[PDB]
Design a protein around this ligand. Sequence first.
Ligand SMILES: [Mg+2]
Ligand SMILES: [Mg+2]
Ligand SMILES: [Mg+2]
Ligand SMILES: [Mg+2]
Lengths: 394, 395
Amino acid sequence: DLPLRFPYGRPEFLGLSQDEVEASADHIARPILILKETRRLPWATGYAEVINAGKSTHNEDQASCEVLTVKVSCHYWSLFDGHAGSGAAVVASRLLQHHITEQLQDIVDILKNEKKIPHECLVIGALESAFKEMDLQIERERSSYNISGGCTALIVICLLGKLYVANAGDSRAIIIRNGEIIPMSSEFTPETERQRLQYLAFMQPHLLGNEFTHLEFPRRVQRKELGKKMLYRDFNMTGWAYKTIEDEDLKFPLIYGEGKKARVMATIGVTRGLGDHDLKVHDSNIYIKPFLSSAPEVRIYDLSKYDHGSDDVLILATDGLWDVLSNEEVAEAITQFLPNCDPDDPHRYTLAAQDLVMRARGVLKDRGWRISNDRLGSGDDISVYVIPLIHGNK
Amino acid sequence: HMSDLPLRFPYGRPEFLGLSQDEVEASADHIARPILILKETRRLPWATGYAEVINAGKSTHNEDQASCEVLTVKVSCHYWSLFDGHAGSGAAVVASRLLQHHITEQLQDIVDILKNIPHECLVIGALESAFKEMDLQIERERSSYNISGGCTALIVICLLGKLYVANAGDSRAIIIRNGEIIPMSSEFTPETERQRLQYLAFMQPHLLGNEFTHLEFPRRVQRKELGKKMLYRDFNMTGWAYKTIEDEDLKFPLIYGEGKKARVMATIGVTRGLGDHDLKVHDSNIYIKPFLSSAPEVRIYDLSKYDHGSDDVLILATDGLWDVLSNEEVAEAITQFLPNCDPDDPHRYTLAAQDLVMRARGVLKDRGWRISNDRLGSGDDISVYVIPLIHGNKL
Ligand SMILES: [Mg+2]
Ligand SMILES: [Mg+2]
Ligand SMILES: [Mg+2]
Ligand SMILES: [Mg+2]
């Protein structure tokens, strides 16, 4: 009905032209696109991506990477895993950096120059406000532009010799530094956020629409067990204890499923990010957005405290990577791939990124996408940054 | 009112001290501040050490309470507990007598699973429910008995070779194992709980009674700054950003202060525990209890992954100790003291407990109580358990 805020596409730094773009969206070939060696990114950052194995017509991942000027320079990398549409992810790929820039400008003069407030806390609050302000802008432009769906957001900035990794979703950032894995992010899923979700449904039961219960049970409760004792978990418990099933325990659980496929209100499997303002429950007028948050967790890495080698890297990747490769596998692939490349070859990290995507996507024969050890490959969109920390050395 | 009701229990010191009430009287001296230790004639489970000392004058009674016994689930469950009472001794006395019965009963619900979802998660759950049920019982009995004030609750059980440390308050548990400090709990303060507190006030603004705002500011906002930009911090923020000050920012902050002066609606400086069901904001009608919680955090230490020594101890203490002694000073004091008593001396850990209390309490000057390096001594009630992990070893 309404116009697109921006045309759909792939990251601008891939310099694709719209016929290249549609050769990319091949669900059976799944071509791995990489940054052309002729186009260098900040810090010679490597990038690689690939479309899902069928579940959405378009690659709903997006990514932006550039050097911001704050009136000081600020390096920037972003990944947005869109869902239920490409809209939010494209909008955030273009506009979040503007919000980050505006928030940093409020505080840039404190940075170059009664609760005591460290300067990092100002930078963190600028990122925190920037995510909040990117939402809101999506919220208010919903009714004028077709900004479909929702997206997670994972961004990194390098400001004054520190990395700030700010995550609101289930993408993941890790540093691989001389083989050790430094996690720079945590995921926001119905699993990791259960207590927050439960407590909010408890404090505001009208958000459940008399269709869900905020209590969590080992398996689905059917009227079969009404009046029997059963294990339950409330927002205040990490553990389990017994309760007599008392009618309302019959409703669909607010949190259901195990692990990576736990879902809030039978609908969404990630609890933070942007968009999803009008997202409702399957065939229902219950809104999901009260339960989601745009608020990112922000972690800091001081680049000045370590002399990083050619192989010490920050990996940014959407769940498409991490859904099949552990942190340890990614570290093993990185540390085994990069020593085979000339350390002064600017393409190194793109090829490392291509290696990671390859190892998560796999090869399609007749048994579906398989990676190493005959494991199912990832059928999701996969986007990978490989950021060489050697260019952040003081 | 509660003042018209009889006491649920008479005031006393921990039962296991076997103090006659002449001895109890002798112990509530605020000038000599006598350090009470466990009589060698009364052994505690695991030869557990215990020492305590009354506050320097800020309340007529020692408002700490402590309970130590071997419970039986119908299996054996060792139980140590500290309650830092406030605004009265009633909650802490009641909790020191009745929380164990809630624990026993919640454990009975899962005892058959234990000796025949991970099992730890069931023990954890029982503790979390027991705390909720010890509150609630206080909440109902409130109407028939004078269960004054509130208290924090730090408890430890040993069940089937694991220690569960359930903390709701600002007492602290640490293991000192071969000189290293293994933290077994986190305090629940207006600072550590800021975002929970702010978000609850955001969700339920009626809890502020139009006297408070949920936003935090680097200092108290003055009316003079209406319309100007100021750093603020909201519930979803760890950092600070700018905002224009808008009338509602002039209300008194929900969280204001730093360290132990940090307070919630200018009334309470600890945010978890039992009791306080009728606690109200300083001169007013705003109830504090909606922001309080009885839910402990539970941490597990597996007593089989390590063959513990004579000097490997779990230290439980109320903030009377941790307010003037850091974890490392406590570790310094344990590792310096315990090597100097016969390993087979059953009074070993009570003496270490006493030494900890004494190192926190200090000596009396014309200026007040001072510890080492002319530092100010603790003026609070101090209660310390030294629990020797050697008694938790395999087999
Ligand atoms: Mg997606
Ligand atoms: Mg994905
Ligand atoms: Mg007290
Ligand atoms: Mg105290």
